[PDB]
Design a protein around this ligand. Sequence first.
Ligand SMILES: Nc1ncnc2c1ncn2[C@@H]1O[C@H](COP(=O)(O)OP(=O)(O)O)[C@@H](O)[C@H]1O
Ligand SMILES: Nc1ncnc2c1ncn2[C@@H]1O[C@H](COP(=O)(O)OP(=O)(O)O)[C@@H](O)[C@H]1O
Ligand SMILES: [Mg+2]
Ligand SMILES: [Zn+2]
Lengths: 102, 611
Amino acid sequence: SDEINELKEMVKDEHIYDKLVRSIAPAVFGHEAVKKGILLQMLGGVHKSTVEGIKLRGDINICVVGDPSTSKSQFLKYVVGFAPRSVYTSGKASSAAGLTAA
Amino acid sequence: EPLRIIWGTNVSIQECTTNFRNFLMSFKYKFRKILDEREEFINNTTDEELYYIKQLNEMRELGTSNLNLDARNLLAYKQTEDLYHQLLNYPQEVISIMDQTIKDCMVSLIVDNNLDYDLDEIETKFYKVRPYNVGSCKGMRELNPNDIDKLINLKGLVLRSTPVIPDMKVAFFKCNVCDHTMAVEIDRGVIQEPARCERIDCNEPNSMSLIHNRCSFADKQVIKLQETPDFVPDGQTPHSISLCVYDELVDSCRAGDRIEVTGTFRSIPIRANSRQRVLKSLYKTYVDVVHVKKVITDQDLAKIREVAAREDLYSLLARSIAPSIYELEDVKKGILLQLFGGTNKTFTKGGRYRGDINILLCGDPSTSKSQILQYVHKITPRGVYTSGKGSSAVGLTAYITRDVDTKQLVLESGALVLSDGGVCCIDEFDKMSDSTRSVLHEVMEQQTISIAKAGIITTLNARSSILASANPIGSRYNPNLPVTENIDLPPPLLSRFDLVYLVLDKVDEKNDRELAKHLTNLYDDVLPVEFLTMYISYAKEHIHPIITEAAKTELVRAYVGMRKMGTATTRQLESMIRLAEAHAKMKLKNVVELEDVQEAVRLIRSAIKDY
DNA sequence: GCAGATATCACTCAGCACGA
DNA sequence: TCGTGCTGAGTGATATCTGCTTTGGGTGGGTGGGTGGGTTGAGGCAAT
Ligand SMILES: Nc1ncnc2c1ncn2[C@@H]1O[C@H](COP(=O)(O)OP(=O)(O)O)[C@@H](O)[C@H]1O
Ligand SMILES: Nc1ncnc2c1ncn2[C@@H]1O[C@H](COP(=O)(O)OP(=O)(O)O)[C@@H](O)[C@H]1O
Ligand SMILES: [Mg+2]
Ligand SMILES: [Zn+2]
């Protein structure tokens, strides 16, 4: 009941969207678009199956491109340290297997 | 009055016990000095005190059951001259007698001294002696049958050790009928089992059963020792000898370590087949280890704190790190600050921040680059001297393999992983394929390596400092063209390095003269390396600087000024922070002052060089 | 021919009741 | 008050008996021998 009360208080606020955007990745400084993208990725989208039987995707993929020395890996480390289920992998270390069924 | 005597000899055990008790009771280290013709070195405090009495008292206070013994001390005394030979020739009986005498001495010390120490703890404790320095170190290729069942001394390299093996000590039997429990001892690996229940009312024969989980057990481990490479006569496969260690000495030596072991050179038969008493005529040889040696005081702390007060400490340390190198004070200073390292930060709501400094030494060929690399490689406690074109991308990080003994998938540690907490060294950075260099991108940024391939998904910590060197594309460095052209390497990579030095061998009539006079004398004091290592270790362990407001107020200014004159990115500000923290560590301060950060920024501008 | 696990038979010992 | 001949009982030594292979794998070898048998497939890494 108490957690439900807190949740409904959260929803009641009319500035929820920007509050969540600001909260995400607190360590990094003022990257609103990237934080918004990470949030929307975390929420995800509805997956549906037509009358056919073919499946329409419902997940979101985001790629952050930037010059070195910028705050790219900080976002990734935050997601790894916050998301319910997640893994961290490197491009050079990873291979066809391990990144897929082996 | 039967007389106890060691089998096959004429030594009375009571004589051994009384002589050892007298030696322990009254022995002063001055005798050891007298024996070695060191009479003039005798003091009046340490050498006039009962050595082993203090050893036993310290044992009791710390609650330990081990007393390391020196045979040369036995030789020093008068009553125990023959005891040395007896120990050498009949190690097992003498060792057992010494253990029992040590226990008796402890009990007598407690009782006679009228101390309040409870007798229960000492009574139920097993005491063991570990003699060492028992004579010349025999070679692994000089052990003959003559030297069987005698105390020998060996040195070698550990190759592999088995996991802990439980060895039975006291068996436990329970009668199936009357549920009566009795404990029986084990002699020579044989259980003295009872034929029938020991009770009088119940005497049912063959009704006793062994309760496996109530018998007392000890620790056993088997190690393989390979002789040192030097002993190899004509370049063949080095020989190996097996060792057995029990109780405390278990898990005392790791794989790939040089140790000196004293033990009994035993021999044991091998059964021809599992289901018969038949034995092979050839006996297996092995060593029963009784001692293993792997080959800060308040006074030192009072001494160390004296150096820190010295005004010219920076110059002293920079001049002592690399005594031979001449007139490279800035390079030496930069190298030194890498050994100390920045300050460690544990940080939730985010990620850990590590104060590790990366230095690049790129310049003209003949200048002392590799020499400094070797000099630092010696000082650091951990590090791998990897080179260019002699290392691989996988070889640096980690290699996936399988364990034959366990038949399980395991992974080895690469050069970077093996340097966790040390300083990695790379010689030819330019002569390295960019495929392998991409590995270093994550090491210098996240201080971790993540591998996901062939069913292994795990991350290995690589919290190490990188010290690399590069040479110019041409035969020398040309000042005219910019830095990004002369040294190769991607421009972005050069920005990652905390400091990037540039040492060039200009031609002059005085610099060359002085250098020649300095490199020819081989055919301004510097601290001994032994003390310097302790200094850096103490500073790295205890001190932990914390930034002050004055530091931030001008650090913002310094970073913004660096960016204004224009390559300069946030990594430079983080490098300034790390360097300021590291320099404060040198002077043993818990607060970073304006002077230290000024020195850090001074070093950074004057490395690339102030055209 | 050789070692080990197994079962067979024969011999000798401590208790018992009676007679001296 | 007591001494000794008969009995059931239980080990000790000895009689027959099964077994004498056994086993998949290269720190068990090839002077133990093939009539005792062993017939992959993906994934990772050095060389280039
Ligand atoms: N906006 C920021 N907020 C906090 N830290 C930052 C920011 N920008 C850069 N940094 C720091 O600079 C360092 C360099 O970034 P890095 O992770 O190397 O980027 P890349 O992923 O491109 O290599 C990071 O470790 C980070 O701590
Ligand atoms: N300033 C100096 N101090 C001491 N030795 C020097 C100095 N400059 C050059 N040398 C000598 O010149 C040689 C340079 O070789 P090296 O250090 O291997 O150069 P690099 O590693 O850069 O190819 C060294 O053996 C060293 O003895
Ligand atoms: Mg070199
Ligand atoms: Zn019983």
